[PDB]
Amino acid sequence: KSIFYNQVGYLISGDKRFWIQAHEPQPFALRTPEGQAVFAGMTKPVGGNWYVGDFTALRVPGTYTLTVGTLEARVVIHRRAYRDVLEAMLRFFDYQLCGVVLPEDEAGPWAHGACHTSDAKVFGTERALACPGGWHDAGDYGKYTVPAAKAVADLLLAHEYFPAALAHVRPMRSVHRAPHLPPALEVAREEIAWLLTMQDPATGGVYHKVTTPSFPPLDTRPEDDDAPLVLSPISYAATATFCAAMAHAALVYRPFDPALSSCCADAARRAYAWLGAHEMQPFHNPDGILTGEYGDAELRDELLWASCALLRMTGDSAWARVCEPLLDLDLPWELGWADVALYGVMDYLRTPRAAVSDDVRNKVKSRLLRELDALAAMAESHPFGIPMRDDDFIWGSNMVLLNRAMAFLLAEGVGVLHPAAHTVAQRAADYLFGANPLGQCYVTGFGQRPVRHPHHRPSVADDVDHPVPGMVVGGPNRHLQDEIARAQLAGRPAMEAYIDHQDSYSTNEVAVYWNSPAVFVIAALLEA
């Protein structure tokens, strides 16, 4: 029996809330560290056992003691409460670096030598290839094209939308090339550079992944993983998500790295030439390969994103001939990793009005507004005010929640101003930081109940005790898709289907595409 609140803190000019399981409204106070009362209010019902306490009006920064009943919590008010967590969430990408020496001056206890240096065999051939750099996908050391495209798309979007907030954070600056680009672009260049090695120079097709034939033991240090590396076959999705992320990078890097920008635009075109010459065939793990499949039977949403990305890159009206029919389909307007349509929607809507049908544009703008209203309706009925239903608590539910928060924020930039946008973003950060039924801070190294045992090979393998900070875990998953979850979590409601245990990969794994929308959301809150 306790207080559920944002364990990282609150913004001076932002919404401040706490939750408790109660039966009636209770008086509550916020005190200074000495004990003097500064704010007083009454709790109020929100659904079931849930009562809220809103202390938004308390604008004087500081470390306050919140008291309700006999319970006590330590809360923090600061003009930049989330800067530290944002910096850590952005440094996670530098911790995930493959084939790069991470020095102790930058990485501290989690420093290591260059891992996965050896070349990879192209599956079913004797041909080898060097595909170095990039990020280890998650808790495993695999490098997967499809989810990598989402991680890049998100960081580029965060820099485009919130560069002022991102300017206050510092990545592992000493491992990147000089002159130093803005923080998010410096971190994302590494993954973009790697992604280019994945494209077949012969055809323009992109390899789905570069992984060892199977998952090594959970206790493997990055440099001790020495099984042969295999390039899984070229896939439609890998190629289409690559084209999309590459054209986006071409626009963003134009004033910062013109050579990379040019290199990315040509790589996107060749990848689009591959799409029109090939069939929409889903990927399936070939015999022997037992690593993450990242499969998807629906590939029109990837074509939509790759077309719209090139439409925004070129600014050519000719591309709308291909976008506009795809924009008419009943595809889920989502932010990945498998349903990517919203990225295409965004790219289309952020293209000059002259190159698009003003009527298709309005229909697209209207669908998005209805989509936001549906997310807003869910948040209005959820006691934590998050656009979530019990059935949305799936594998990587924190990404579902963050992508939804991110959907509201992206829309603010294409004239779709929902009155719920900022509340939803605040509630999503509160949830992530401990305002959930488990009182769990879903980020490592932060809050009073941080994640101590994630499914992360460098954090399990090392003898440090504390895991790498700034890692966002998948979160509660009702399907119980691992032995530890099947064992400990049967019968538990959707939001409580989480376990802080290293073997629970379905609720406790970390990932590059789970940290990326967190970076967007946190930067949005700081900026506004």
Pick the catalytic residue: 15, 324, 500, 501? 500
> Is 509 among the residues known to form the active site?
yes
Interface with Ca ion (CB under 5 A): 296, 298, 301, 338
Which stretch in 9-17, 99-107, 414-422, 502-510 sits in contact with ligand 9MR by CB under 6 A? 502-510
Q: Which residues contact 320 (CB under 8 A, 6 or more apart)?
A: 311, 355, 356, 357, 360
Q: What does 287-319 look like in DSSP terms, one character per residue?
A: TT--S-----S--HHHHHHHHHHHHHHH--GGG
- Interstrand relation of 71-78 and 37-42 (parallel, antiparallel or unpaired): unpaired
DSSP letter at 337 equals S
* Alpha carbon distance 61, 81 (integer Å): 10
Contact 269, 255 (CB under 8 A): no
Annotated binding-site members for Ca(2+): 296, 298, 301-302, 338, 459, 462, 464
Min dist. Cβ of residue 3 to ligand 9MR (A): 31
Between CA 402 and CA 518 the distance in angstroms is: 6
Q: Which does 208 bind (CB under 5 to 8 A by kind): Ca ion, Zn ion, ligand 9MR, none?
A: none
User: Is residue 227 a contact point for ligand 9MR (CB under 6 A)?
Assistant: no
The secondary structure of 509-525 as a DSSP string is: B-BHHHHHHHHHHHHHH
Measuring CA to CA, which residue among 480, 488, 487 is closest to residue 505? 480
Q: Is 154 among the residues that bind ligand 9MR (CB under 6 A)?
A: no
* Region of 76-84, 138-146, 255-263, 320-328 interacting with ligand 9MR (CB under 6 A): 138-146
Residue span binding Zn ion (CB under 5 A) among the ranges 33-41, 110-118, 162-170, 330-338: 110-118
Q: Which of 112, 159, 208, 455 is catalytic?
A: 455
Which one among 116, 150, 208, 455 touches Zn ion, defined by CB under 5 A? 116
- Under the binding rule (CB under 6 A), the answer on residue 335 touching ligand 9MR is no
Binding-site annotation, residues for Zn(2+): 98, 115-116, 136
- 115 binds, options Ca ion, Zn ion, ligand 9MR, none, Cβ within 5 to 8 A by partner type: Zn ion
- Please report whether residue 41 would count as binding ligand 9MR according to CB under 6 A: no
SS3 letters across 114-158: CCCCCCEEECCCCCEECCCCCECCECCCCEEHHHHHHHHHHHHHH
> Judged by CB under 5 A, which of 22, 75, 77, 98 binds Zn ion?
98
Residue 296 binds which of Zn ion, Ca ion, ligand 9MR, none (CB < 5-8 A, kind-dependent):
Ca ion
Exactly one of 218, 280, 369, 376 binds ligand 9MR (CB under 6 A); that residue is 218
Give the C-alpha distances (Å, rounded to integers) separating 117 from 99, 229, 313, 362. 6, 10, 34, 50
Active site residue 500: yes
Q: What's the min distance (Å) between Cβ of 517 and Ca ion? A: 17
CB neighbour list of residue 30: distance below 8 Å, 6 or more residues apart: 37, 38, 39, 40, 55, 58, 64, 65, 66, 67, 75
Q: Is 455 a catalytic residue?
A: yes
Per-position b or e across 151-167, b if 16+ CB within 10 A of its CB: bbbbbbbbbebbeebbe
User: CA 511, CA 406: separation in Å to the nearest integer?
Assistant: 17
**Sheet with strand 50-54: strands edge to edge:** 4-5, 17-21, 50-54, 44-47
137 binds ligand 9MR (CB under 6 A): yes
Least gap, CB of 291 to Ca ion (angstroms): 20
Q: Hunting for tokens 């309700």 — which residue is that? A: 68
Q: Which residue from 509, 512, 516, 525 is in contact with ligand 9MR, where contact means CB under 6 A?
A: 509
Could you tell me how far CA 181 lies from the centroid of its own chain? 21
Report if residue 396 touches ligand 9MR, rule: CB under 6 A. yes
> From residue 141 to residue 180, what is the string marking binding to Zn ion with x (rule CB under 5 A)?
----------------------------------------
Enumerate binding residues for Zn ion (CB under 5 A): 98, 115-116
Enumerate binding residues for ligand 9MR (CB under 6 A): 137-140, 142, 215, 218, 292-293, 395-396, 503, 505, 509, 511
Catalytic residue positions?
A: 455, 500, 509
